[PDB]
């Protein structure tokens, strides 16, 4: 289950990050497995997509994620993030595939950000259409 991961949001700097966007995305760090930075990796609802630990420093504490998050069905990397946390009720998205780099771009000025569970190299044609709504 993906709400099987907790959430915590404590003075630490793991990640050389500013936290002044991440109480407004909601993303804490979860403590299901270590303390590394965790940020809720699921849409609207609650699926299953993989809401493992990010790359935290962007060098080490799980630089890698999982694709599923309950025991059952696992899914595969065309689920969506951050546009989910954002209104995205605009004309200007930026297009990321990390994490991180849809954190900033959500604290820059304004401008929304859009990526997928592994917006890295994932498939661009699973929600062409939402991309293309801009």
């Not at 793991?14 to 990796?41: D, Y």
């Not at 954002?86 to 401008?111: I, N, W, Y």
């Amino acid at each position: 289950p993906e709400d099987e991961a907790q959430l915590i949001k404590t003075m630490f700097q793991i990640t050389k990050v500013s936290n002044a966007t991440l109480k407004k995305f909601g993303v804490r760090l979860f403590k299901p497995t270590k303390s590394l930075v965790f940020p809720w990796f699921a849409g609207p609802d609650s699926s299953l997509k993989g809401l493992k630990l990010l790359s935290a420093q962007n060098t080490d504490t799980e630089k890698v994620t999982y694709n599923e998050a309950t025991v059952p069905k696992i899914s595969s990397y065309y689920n969506l993030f951050g546009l989910t946390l954002v209104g995205r009720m605009d004309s200007e998205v930026v297009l990321t595939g990390h994490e991180l780099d849809t954190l900033a771009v959500s604290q820059a000025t304004g401008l929304p950000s859009v990526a997928l569970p592994r917006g890295v190299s994932c498939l661009p044609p699973m929600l062409l259409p939402y991309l293309e709504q801009f």
